[PDB]
Amino acid sequence: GSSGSSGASRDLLKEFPQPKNLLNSVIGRALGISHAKDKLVYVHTNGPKKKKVTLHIKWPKSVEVEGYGSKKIDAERQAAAAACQLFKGWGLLGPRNELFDAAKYRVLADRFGSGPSSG
């Protein structure tokens, strides 16, 4: 790729309407909805006019994103959506946001990192 700078002018939500369900569904399939709980962490801040939420993701790799919005849900939504894009490019979602088979997910996460498990 030639271009690749930080900053998304276009609204991500447009592509990811339900990031709270879509994102969760991902890790929930690869590892397990029960586990995903911790995998996706939400941190709320206080100070700036609008509320912000920092979604701290671990799977596949350790990453984080910011989510803006009027209400709690509004902000939380963005955060997740901000990550959905990462899962798409990485190869966890796909061109049409079509999840994959568990087995595949296991490998997709391996290339990213290898926890205490040998597999």
UniProtKB/Swiss-Prot annotation:
Report the protein name in the record: ATP-dependent RNA helicase DHX30
- Give the quaternary structure: Identified in a complex with TFAM and SSBP1. Interacts with AGO1 and AGO2. Interacts (via N-terminus) with ZC3HAV1 (via N-terminal domain) in an RNA-independent manner. Found in a complex with GRSF1, DDX28, FASTKD2 and FASTKD5.
Species whose genome carries this gene:
Homo sapiens
Gene that encodes it: DHX30
Family named by the database record: Belongs to the DEAD box helicase family. DEAH subfamily.
What job does this protein perform?
A: RNA-dependent helicase. Plays an important role in the assembly of the mitochondrial large ribosomal subunit. Required for optimal function of the zinc-finger antiviral protein ZC3HAV1. Associates with mitochondrial DNA. Involved in nervous system development and differentiation through its involvement in the up-regulation of a number of genes which are required for neurogenesis, including GSC, NCAM1, neurogenin, and NEUROD.
The DRBM domain sits at 19-87
The disorder on record is: Neurodevelopmental disorder with variable motor and language impairment: An autosomal dominant neurodevelopmental disorder characterized by global developmental delay, intellectual disability, speech impairment and gait abnormalities.
Protein localization = Cytoplasm; Mitochondrion; Mitochondrion matrix, Mitochondrion nucleoid
Whole-protein coverage range:
42 to 147 of 1194
